[PDB]
Amino acid sequence: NLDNMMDGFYIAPAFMDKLVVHITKNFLTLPNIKVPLILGIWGGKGQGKSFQCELVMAKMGINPIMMSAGPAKLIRQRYREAADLIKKGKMCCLFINDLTTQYTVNNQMVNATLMNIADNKEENARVPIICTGNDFSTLYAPLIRDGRMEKFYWAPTREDRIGVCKGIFRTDKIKDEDIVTLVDQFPGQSIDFFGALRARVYDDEVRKFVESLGVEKIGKRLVNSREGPPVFEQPEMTYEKLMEYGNMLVMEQENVKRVQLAETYLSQA
């Protein structure tokens, strides 16, 4: 089973299974089973990871105490904030986006050893910790062999990419058959590329609206009206338009690379 959709956005079944089971195991009393407190999700940037995490946690009705970079005493602060949401009978977990990093490893290690009592007097709630990153340094291996941290490698399949995109363009004109074709036309592109693609079409349509109205008339039409910020009408999103936008972003990706490579031919001055 497992219902893999939240607000029209698709969740990868295997991503969801690992995460839900992790959280569930952490909120049950098992016989003599070493339950990892931490779950490390890794793969190349731009894929689902943090976004998928947010959708699973939402589906379950969880408001997670989140962080990124962004001393190491803040981890204990956010941890206890989550442990307090549990005390008030509201399932919560600690979610750390994108992984000086020397103390955090220890801070995580001290929590993993004594999670029911983490201070910085009464004894607190156990909080599952969910971490997203790129490769996860050999720095994290002591938790891995102990069984305090479980490592999960996740890379989206063609169906995950298609699933996610249908959710991204759910509110838009486009047919699903066209969304599949667009995904197939850019197989070297991560999921955030399709999000960047949609964002640029909107950014261009707002420019057409601004150019057609005029700089001087924007203020009065947008803010003066006794109630609410106006709803912007969705642009006509054909396959060909999305395709031109897509190809344009690839050019921008390539030109940045070309420029960096071309600079090697000129002396440092």
Curated annotation (Swiss-Prot):
Cellular component, GO, one term: plastoglobule
Q: Which residues cross the membrane?
A: none
Specify whether Nuclease is a keyword of the entry.
Answer: no
**Which positions carry Phosphothreonine?**
T132
Q: Molecular function (GO) terms listed?
A: ADP binding; ATP binding; ATP hydrolysis activity; enzyme regulator activity; mRNA binding; ribulose-1,5-bisphosphate carboxylase/oxygenase activator activity
Instruction: Using the UniProt record, give the first listed, main subcellular location.
Output: plastid
Highest taxon above the source species: Eukaryota
Gene Ontology annotations of biological process type: leaf senescence; response to cold; response to jasmonic acid; response to light stimulus
Residue positions binding ATP: G43, G44, K45, G46, Q47, G48, K49, S50
Q: Which UniProt keywords apply?
A: ATP-binding, Chloroplast, Nucleotide-binding, Phosphoprotein, Plastid, Transit peptide
Q: Where in the cell is it found?
A: Plastid, Chloroplast stroma; Plastid, Chloroplast, Plastoglobule
Nucleotide-binding as a keyword of this entry, yes or no, is: yes
What is the recorded function of this protein according to its Swiss-Prot or TrEMBL entry?
Answer: Activation of RuBisCO (ribulose-1,5-bisphosphate carboxylase/oxygenase; EC 4.1.1.39) involves the ATP-dependent carboxylation of the epsilon-amino group of lysine leading to a carbamate structure.
Q: Which family does it belong to?
A: Belongs to the RuBisCO activase family.
This protein's name: Ribulose bisphosphate carboxylase/oxygenase activase, chloroplastic
